[model samples]
Target: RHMRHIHLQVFGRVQGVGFRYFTQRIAMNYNIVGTVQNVDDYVEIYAQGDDADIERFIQGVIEGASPASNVTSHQLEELELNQKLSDFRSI
Candidate 1:
C-alpha cells in the first residue's frame, strides 16, 4: 500500500482551544498513524496514511476548526513515510 506523511504546524489560537481534540477526532476516521502536539505558539500534527486520506484529514482540520477557533495560518510539509507508526494520538 502506498503511504505518505503530513507534517504541519498550525498557528493562532490553536492552544487551549480544542485543536488537538479536533485533530484526534478527524484522525480516527482515517487509517492514519501519527501524533498531534501543543507547542509554545502553535500546534503540530504529524500524520501518515494513504495520500488521499491524509489530504482529506488535513482539509477537514482546516474546515472543521475554522468555526470553533481562530487558526490564522498553518504550514504543511511532506515527510518520508514512517512505517513504524501503528496508531494516531495526541502527543
Candidate 2:
C-alpha cells in the first residue's frame, strides 16, 4: 500500500478546451495512471501512483495549463486505496 488514490476536481472554465487531453499528458509525465472526464464546468481526474510520484502529479494539477486550460478552484479527496487506474485517458 505504498501508492495513493485520489479524486481531484478542478473547477473553472475547463470544458471543451482540451484540458482533459492536456491532463493525460501530465499524468504520463509523472507516470500516474487515471482518467479525465467533465463534471459540469469542472473536470474530474482520477489518479493513483506511488506517493512520491503523485506529489508531482498534483503540482501539475494546480499549475496552469497553457495552450488550453483554466483553474479557479480545486478539490482533492483521499479515496479508498485501490489500484483503479491502468492508463491515463481523456474521455
Candidate 3:
C-alpha cells in the first residue's frame, strides 16, 4: 500500500489536557504509526500511514480532542514517505 507522512502542530488549550493521550488512542484504532508529543504550550504529531487512515487520523486529532482540550489552530505539513513507522506512540 502507498504510505504518507504528516507533521501536525496543534495550538490552543492543548497542553496538560490529555491531548497526547487522545492522539495516541486515535492512532491505536488505525493502521497509522508515528509519535505525538508536547512542545511548550502546543502539541506536535508526526504520523505516517495509509493515505485514508492518515486523513482520518488528522480529523480525529483535530476534532476528537478531550473535552478540556480546545484546539484553536493547527498546521499540517506533508512529508515524503521516506519510510514507514513500526508503531505509534507518545513521547
Top candidate on lDDT is 3
Query: lDDT values of the candidates?
Result: 0.82, 0.80, 0.86
Which of 1 and 3 is the better model by TM-score?
A: 3
Off by over 4 Å in 3: 82-84
**Shift of residue 24 alpha carbon in model 2, Å:** 0.5
Number of colliding residue pairs in each model: 0, 0, 0
List the lowest-lDDT window of 10 residues for candidate 2.
61-70
| Per-residue lDDT of model 1, residues 25-45, tens digit only | 788887778999988878888
lDDT of 3: 0.86
Error of 2 at 65 (Å): 3.4
**Model 2 lDDT on a 0 to 1 scale:** 0.80
Q: Over the stretch 6-80, how does candidate 3's per-residue lDDT look in tens digits?
A: 999988889888888888888987787889999888999999988889888998888746778888899999998
Clashing pairs in 1: none
Comparing 1 with 2 on lDDT, the higher-scoring candidate is 1
The 10 consecutive residues of candidate 3 with the worst lDDT sum are: 80-89
Q: How do the residues 1-91 of candidate 2 rate in per-residue lDDT, one tens digit apiece?
A: 6898889998877787778777877888888887889887788888888888888888787675435666888899998766655888888
Candidate ranking under TM-score, highest first, comes to: 3, 1, 2
Better of 2 and 3 by lDDT: 3
